[PDB]
Structure 1
């Protein structure tokens, strides 16, 4: 290029290379129209990927805020995107969206993972999830179709996999206890206080059951015949 009499030549700007693993996040310094023909306002931040241009030149109207690597959630993974941009094109502040299911997306401008890609919960026959519905209306959230209120703790169990929705929250892990005949555990149903002393097959506490201590009037050494007794079972 031969500069004109007036063109003061500045530094040569190279194009950033976009693979499907990266996207370019940049803010429009001022109102203009990009190469692809999209309006942009003075301060709007957005992403350019391989679906638009394989090698994007930072325009004079754009400031490259950075390069975002692709966030890939494996077949067994989920993430909680904070402030997800809705259909209108703006970050929904305060809100959060759970995303899972072997996906690979880009963190939109303003979005941020809650705790990153953590793990998807997998529980067997002897594992549970004690959950709290700190936000009400868990009606169509899963197959159970039972609508939990705002705070009523409940236990989900079975050989299955779970992703905690935005409303629900994991309270505890609830490992079961293996019991045979003539053996059991003292369970107090804190929702009613009643102690049941459930014996027989293996058992795990429900949403509102706690191991209950059984005190003996010093008549324990005479029945054991060093190691303290498990005074809860």
Structure 2
């Protein structure tokens, strides 16, 4: 049929045979497809992002400084393809053709006050405070709070802060040429203790 029924908060993708490109048709419109227009799939609910959650969709539409969806000269949505987009929280928005949903309504991580996060970067990127982070740079994020899951930063594991009770010390061991809290040269294979009561 040439008649389509789009509810107020649903979207579809139409591949125009003549216009030779695809585009998004956000509702609410019970739009009628032209003879050239062909609908791909049935109406699907908008990509909703409740608060206190997050999602990331690959191949984001590359928007300019005005955050407008730039359509290509041919007519297809201009995607970044390789890159990704960090979606924190907003109203239910339409997916554009060529966008692959990777994460969807996944809960925002919650770091406990007595734990941290182990982080891999994967290539170089500029940090929040203008810090150049290598592809193999190691970052630690202690809470409490809520870190934002980035496309340039990956979470490895959960660090459990070992508690040291009174008249105790913690045997450590360094896996690289690093510096501990006491600022002493910590070569690989060296061991040392902690001299402060507390987590």
Total equivalences in the alignment: 175
Name the residue aligned to 1:15.
4
Residues 183-224 of structure 1: per-residue CA shift (max 9 Å, x gap): 232111212323222254344xxxxxxxxxxxxxxxxxxxxx
Deviations 1:17-55 (A, max 9, x none): 331x2012111111xxxxxxxxxx21x1111122xx521
2:46 to 47, 70, 74: 70
The 3-state SS of whatever aligns with 1:17 is coil
**Superposed, which structure 2 residues align to 1:45-60 within 5 Å?**
45-50=22-27, 54-60=29-35
Structure number with greater CO (CA < 8 Å, separation at least 6) is 2
RMSD: 2.0
Structure possessing the higher radius of gyration over alpha carbons: 1
> Which ranges of structure 1 fall in alignment gaps of 5 or more residues?
1-11, 31-40, 204-233
User: Normalized against structure 2, the TM-score is what?
Assistant: 0.78
Task: Report SS of the residue matched to 1:93.
Answer: coil
Structure 1: distance between partners of 2:14 and 2:48? 21
How has the CA–CA distance of structure 1 residues 163 and 103 changed in structure 2, closer, same or farther, with 3 Å as cutoff?
A: farther
Give, in angstroms, the shift of residue 115 of structure 1.
Answer: 3.4
For structure 2, list consecutive stretches of 5 or more residues without a partner in the other structure: 64-69, 72-77, 177-186
Q: Which residue of 2 aligns with 1:34?
A: none
Is the Cα–Cα contact under 8 Å of residues 68 and 106 in structure 1 kept in the other structure?
A: no
